[PDB]
Amino acid sequence: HLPILEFKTEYRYPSTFEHEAQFKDTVLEFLAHEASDIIIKQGVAISAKVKGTLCTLSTRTLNFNEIERIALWASGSSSVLTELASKKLINTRYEVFHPTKLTTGGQKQRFGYRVNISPVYIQGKTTAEIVMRSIPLDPLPLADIGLSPELVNQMCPDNGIVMVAGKTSSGKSTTFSSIIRYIMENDTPIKGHLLTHEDPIEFVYDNIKSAHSIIAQSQIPEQFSSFAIANQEALRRTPNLIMIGELRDKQSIESAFEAANTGHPVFATVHSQNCSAVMRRLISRFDESVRGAAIYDLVETTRFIMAQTLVRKTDGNLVAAREYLNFTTDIREQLLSLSDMGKVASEVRRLVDEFGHPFSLEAERLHSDGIIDGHVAKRLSMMS
Amino acid sequence: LHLPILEFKTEYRYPSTFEHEAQFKDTVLEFLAHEASDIIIKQGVAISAKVKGTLCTLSTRTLNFNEIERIALWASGSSSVLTELASKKLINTRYEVFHPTKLTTGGQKQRFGYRVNISPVYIQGKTTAEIVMRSIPLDPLPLADIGLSPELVNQMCPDNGIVMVAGKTSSGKSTTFSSIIRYIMENDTPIKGHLLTHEDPIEFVYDNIKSAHSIIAQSQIPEQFSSFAIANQEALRRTPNLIMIGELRDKQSIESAFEAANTGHPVFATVHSQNCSAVMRRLISRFDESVRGAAIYDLVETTRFIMAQTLVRKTDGNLVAAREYLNFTTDIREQLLSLSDMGKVASEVRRLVDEFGHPFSLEAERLHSDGIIDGHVAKRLSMMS
């Protein structure tokens, strides 16, 4: 057995890897398949994740030398074997140029990758294994990622917290980047100063021209020790929008509460699988003594909850199925009038079914189109 | 002149004094000619190995603390290991010896794999190292050999969340997980792609496992990553489709499991626990009461499947694995969530394994009916674990 094998674009897989350009070229084929990530390790052919599956351009296997020089070309020095042996973590960036395709500004397009180089153990020896994660530049417009202007306007309140929920960075990052680019490109309730705080910063808005808004991005570990510090600082920064981060600590959730209650959009990401799961995860953070106050704040400040997952369409390629509830003034008024606040989670699950877009409905409507087969639809409906 | 048994030699003459690594590897190869399973190097006596359980040596000559120094350097990952010994660091690693005389494999070569304990000892008023290398299986074992049903292990390989096998140290969780991974990448399973394993001592290797859909990277955790925490921080930086992390032993390990799982990865964890309830209780106890609610919710929500396992000696005299397991479905998990009291979760889990899972009592009953275990053994299994 062997990994799935790609079809090339006028590119000759080398017998061997001696010339960096040799490597840039492979990288460029993998781009032409738009492979998101690229694993190079010994005893295996250079691999990438295309439409989420592992794929190779050859059956040749990297010898130790090939990998040794690649480690060099992938950003860093020839010290990288010692540096790995020095228990130093090798996380860098590597850019590649597209040969004849050009930027809107007459610039040769840059391609970013985040390269990690990690000790692995194979054929009895400690070698390097290198994973390069493609870096997006420009946010994708709504149509390309499948969100309608009508739907997105609901996610642009003048205050409160819009949460996108999900189980991987990529989906959330992309959705929120798209929604921001749309925000600054169109006439929305949200206008002005837009801060984003990003662990890895991914999308950039250098090429997004706005009539009415400016955007400032801060990478959090490098520039802002912590997200808490970044959000504390943002209030000194007259934001009209705060892309907060991951909303997993109690401190994070309460900071989101405070920012929303100072009256400017907070966009937050949540590692949960659906909207009720979002609610009950967020509630879980708080002790019972404070849990009522916390629930009131959460219901009153939340304006919109989107969970999404990625499902393979009929075509090999993937798509984002989305459940969302829009927290209308009606919805919030209902949720606040619950004799029992243990039920809020449950209640929200009800309400998403009543006035929202549940995963069952999304599976149903994608399946009504040729887009997802019945198995993927049933799986997605049980995401719920 | 009293001496342990010494072998008749195949291929080489014993060194005057161990200096070069190649002499030591050659000695290991001599022991292997005799099918030696374990090797003890200690100061007072000649390098010995256990052939068919009995101690033996290649020579009458004893070793100086110097050559025990050297040998310790060779077998261990680290340099100047004695300072690490006096730092009360536990030094278990792995050590490999390839066969000299073109003994090759079904493929291209043939390698022998060793689990190396180095332990502080006391000899003649001085602290020393004793070294012990146990030959350990190189390639993961098929499911049939470890007595797992493909259906069950498919049960245990979600797209996301935490799969835990609990047990005592001598219960071969590592073996179970290695089998489950080998099967993962040899068959069509929900989990496929980049699989990372972080292993203190790396035991099994996947060099000879051909996969249609998956690549595996193993990282040894003392020697290649300084800590498990670092390896798991790095794991997300890579593009993992499965992370075999460490033991879930302290708050930080459990939290790393939480992060990996919540960023959408299968997470394979071991727990030092006798049964599933005990696993839950133990993991929950790692967190302070202030954070322990959050920690509980995270724990129930990220867990997909819990296996406790023991090695019990069977009527034949050999030992097999008794397994109790619970599969955490959406229904099971939500039913764990929706308690009046969350402090009761552990209790609940007990209940639940009896109701929907494979408790130890059932497993002992079915082992005993097929005559695998003697009846006493079955009673012991039912009593607790």
**A114 phi, psi to nearest 5 deg:** -90, 110
Q: Provide the CB-side half-sphere exposure for B218 (13 A, CA).
A: 20
Among chain A residues, CA nearest to B196: A120
Query: Cβ(B83)–Cβ(B100) under 8 Å?
Result: no
Q: In sequence order, what DSSP letters do the residues of B222-281 get, joined into one string? A: TTTSS-HHHHHHHHHHS--SEEEEEE--SHHHHHHHHHHHHTT-EEEEEE--SSHHHHHH
Mutate to test the interface with A, among B78, B99, B262 (most CBs of A within 10 A): B262
C-beta pairs of B247-253 under 8 Å, 24+ apart in sequence? B247/B271, B247/B272, B248/B164, B248/B283, B250/B286, B251/B286, B251/B287, B253/B228, B253/B229
Give the DSSP H/E element, type plus range, for residue A160.
Answer: none
In three-state form (DSSP H/G/I as H, E/B as E, the rest C), the secondary structure along A287-324 is CHHHHHHHHHHHHHHEEEEEEEEEEECCCCCEEEEEEE
Q: How far is A162 from chain B (nearest CA, A)?
A: 20
* CA distance readout (Å), B28 to A29, A365, B51: 47, 66, 12
Residues of A with CB below 8 A from B304's CB? Answer: none
In this structure, what DSSP letter does residue B11 have? S
User: How far is A89 from A74, CA to CA, in rounded Å?
Assistant: 14
Residues of B with CB below 8 A from A3's CB? Answer: 211-213, 215
Task: Kindly determine whether residue A121 and residue B211, on different chains, have CB atoms separated by under 8 Å.
Answer: no
**Tokens encoding B321:** 């694995």
**Tokens encoding A242:** 């705060």
By C-alpha distance, which of A28, A20, A301 is closest to A159?
A: A301
**Residue listed under structure tokens 């859909």:** B213
Which residue type is seen at A81?
A: L
Return the bridge partners of A320, or none: A310
Task: Kindly determine whether residue A53 and residue B193, on different chains, have CB atoms separated by under 8 Å.
Answer: yes
**Tokens encoding B124:** 């003649």
In three-state form (DSSP H/G/I as H, E/B as E, the rest C), the secondary structure along A82-127 is HHHHCCCCEEEEEEEEEEEEECCCCCEEEEEEEEEEEEEEECCEEE
User: How far is B258 from B298, CA to CA, in rounded Å?
Assistant: 7
Residues of B with CB below 8 A from A84's CB? Answer: 224
* CA distance readout (Å), B158 to A36, A222, B164, B189, B296: 23, 34, 12, 9, 20
Give the DSSP H/E element, type plus range, for residue B62.
Answer: none
Helix axes A64-73, A20-32, angle to 10 degrees: 80
Q: How far is B136 from chain A (nearest CA, A)?
A: 14
User: How far is B42 from A237, CA to CA, in rounded Å?
Assistant: 67
User: How far is B306 from B275, CA to CA, in rounded Å?
Assistant: 9
User: How far is B150 from A95, CA to CA, in rounded Å?
Assistant: 44
**B228 phi, psi to nearest 5 deg:** -60, -45
**B50 phi, psi to nearest 5 deg:** -95, 105
Query: Cβ(A129)–Cβ(A41) under 8 Å?
Result: yes
- A271-281: burial string, b at 16+ Cβ within 10 Å, e else: bbbbbbbbbbb
Residues of B with CB below 8 A from A2's CB? Answer: 210, 212
Strands of the sheet containing A318-326, edge to edge, are: A214-219, A193-198, A241-245, A266-270, A161-165, A302-312, A318-326
Task: Kindly determine whether residue A168 and residue B263, on different chains, have CB atoms separated by under 8 Å.
Answer: yes
Give Cβ neighbours of residue B125 (< 8 Å, ≥ 6 apart). none
Query: Cβ(B275)–Cβ(B385) under 8 Å?
Result: yes
Query: Cβ(A45)–Cβ(A85) under 8 Å?
Result: no
Residue A90 class from Cβ within 10 Å (0-12 exposed, 13-18 middle, 19+ buried)? buried
Helix-, strand-, coil-residue percentages of chain B, each rounded to 5: 35, 25, 40
Query: Cβ(B359)–Cβ(B324) under 8 Å?
Result: yes
Which ranges of chain B does DSSP label H, i.e. alpha helix?
21-33, 65-75, 81-86, 143-146, 150-155, 173-186, 228-237, 251-262, 276-285, 289-302, 330-337, 345-356, 360-369, 376-383
Among chain A residues, CA nearest to B187: A1
User: How far is B219 from B335, CA to CA, in rounded Å?
Assistant: 37
Return the bridge partners of A96, or none: A111
Helix axes A288-301, A250-261, angle to 10 degrees: 40
Give the DSSP H/E element, type plus range, for residue B100.
Answer: none
**Overall residue count recorded for chain B in this entry:** 385
- Beta-sheet pairing, B194-199 with B242-247: parallel
Categorise residue B102: left if φ over 0, alpha if ψ from -120 to 50, beta otherwise.
Answer: left
**Residue listed under structure tokens 């590897």:** B25
Experimental method: X-ray
Residue B61 class from Cβ within 10 Å (0-12 exposed, 13-18 middle, 19+ buried)? middle
- A116 closest CB neighbour out of B207, B211, B237: B237
Categorise residue A287: left if φ over 0, alpha if ψ from -120 to 50, beta otherwise.
Answer: beta
By C-alpha distance, which of B340, B337, B339, B312 is closest to B324?
A: B312
* CA distance readout (Å), B84 to B80, B119, B125: 8, 11, 19
Q: How far is B240 from chain A (nearest CA, A)?
A: 10
C-beta pairs of B66-70 under 8 Å, 24+ apart in sequence? B67/B17, B67/B18, B67/B19, B68/B41, B68/B42, B68/B43, B68/B128, B68/B129, B68/B131, B69/B129, B70/B18, B70/B19, B70/B24
By C-alpha distance, which of A305, A231, A243, A248 is closest to A282?
A: A248
User: How far is B113 from B206, CA to CA, in rounded Å?
Assistant: 13
Categorise residue B212: left if φ over 0, alpha if ψ from -120 to 50, beta otherwise.
Answer: alpha
Count of CB atoms situated within 10 Å of the CB of A210:
16
Return the bridge partners of A81, or none: none
Residues of B with CB below 8 A from A53's CB? Answer: 192-193, 213
Q: In sequence order, what DSSP letters do the residues of B335-385 get, joined into one string? A: HHHS-S-GGGHHHHHHHHHHHHSB-HHHHHHHHHHTT-S-SHHHHHHHHT-
What is the sign of the dihedral through the CA atoms of A361, A363, A365 and A367?
Answer: negative
Query: Cβ(B175)–Cβ(B141) under 8 Å?
Result: yes
CA dihedral A226, A253, B349, B334 (to 10 degrees): -130
Query: Cβ(A201)–Cβ(A217) under 8 Å?
Result: yes
Task: Kindly determine whether residue A121 and residue B224, on different chains, have CB atoms separated by under 8 Å.
Answer: yes
Task: Kindly determine whether residue B298 and residue A287, on different chains, have CB atoms separated by under 8 Å.
Answer: no
* CA distance readout (Å), A94 to A11, A70, A130, B254, B266: 20, 11, 12, 33, 29
By C-alpha distance, which of A225, A251, A233 is closest to A195?
A: A233
By C-alpha distance, which of B190, B194, B111, B187 is closest to B143?
A: B187
Return the bridge partners of B132, or none: B40, B117
* CA distance readout (Å), B37 to A225, B74, B141: 51, 19, 18
**Overall residue count recorded for chain A in this entry:** 384
Query: Cβ(A314)–Cβ(A372) under 8 Å?
Result: yes
Helix axes B228-237, B251-262, angle to 10 degrees: 10
**Residue listed under structure tokens 């229904």:** B331
- B263 closest CB neighbour out of A2, A43, A169: A169
Strands of the sheet containing A53-56, edge to edge, are: A4-5, A53-56, A47-50, A37-40, A125-135, A108-122, A90-102
Which ranges of chain A does DSSP label H, i.e. alpha helix?
20-32, 64-73, 80-85, 142-145, 149-153, 169-185, 220-223, 227-234, 250-261, 275-284, 288-301, 329-336, 344-355, 359-368, 374-383
Helix axes B65-75, B21-33, angle to 10 degrees: 80
In this structure, what DSSP letter does residue A14 have? -
In angstroms, what is the resolution?
Answer: 2.8
Residues of B with CB below 8 A from A285's CB? Answer: 293-294
User: How far is B255 from B233, CA to CA, in rounded Å?
Assistant: 11
User: How far is A305 from A325, CA to CA, in rounded Å?
Assistant: 5
By C-alpha distance, which of B256, B222, B217 is closest to B239?
A: B217
Residues of B with CB below 8 A from A131's CB? Answer: 194, 237-239
In this structure, what DSSP letter does residue A166 have? -
State how far Cα B379 lies from the chain centre: 28
Task: Kindly determine whether residue A47 and residue B215, on different chains, have CB atoms separated by under 8 Å.
Answer: yes
User: How far is A335 from A317, CA to CA, in rounded Å?
Assistant: 39
User: How far is A186 from B246, CA to CA, in rounded Å?
Assistant: 49
User: How far is B232 from B238, CA to CA, in rounded Å?
Assistant: 10
C-beta pairs of B244-249 under 8 Å, 24+ apart in sequence? B244/B177, B244/B181, B244/B195, B244/B196, B244/B197, B244/B198, B244/B199, B244/B268, B245/B198, B245/B269, B246/B198, B246/B200, B246/B221, B246/B270, B247/B271, B247/B272, B248/B164, B248/B283
Among chain A residues, CA nearest to B300: A281
**B270 phi, psi to nearest 5 deg:** -100, 150
Residues of A with CB below 8 A from B239's CB? Answer: 36-37, 39, 49, 131, 133
User: How far is B230 from B166, CA to CA, in rounded Å?
Assistant: 23
Give the DSSP H/E element, type plus range, for residue B148.
Answer: none
**Residue listed under structure tokens 């000892």:** B121
Return the bridge partners of B111, or none: B98
Residue A339 class from Cβ within 10 Å (0-12 exposed, 13-18 middle, 19+ buried)? exposed
Mutate to test the interface with B, among A131, A168, A289 (most CBs of B within 10 A): A131
Query: Cβ(A1)–Cβ(B212) under 8 Å?
Result: yes
Query: Cβ(A120)–Cβ(B216) under 8 Å?
Result: no
Among chain B residues, CA nearest to A288: B293
Query: Cβ(B91)–Cβ(B71) under 8 Å?
Result: no
- A10-26: burial string, b at 16+ Cβ within 10 Å, e else: eeebeeebeeeebbbbb
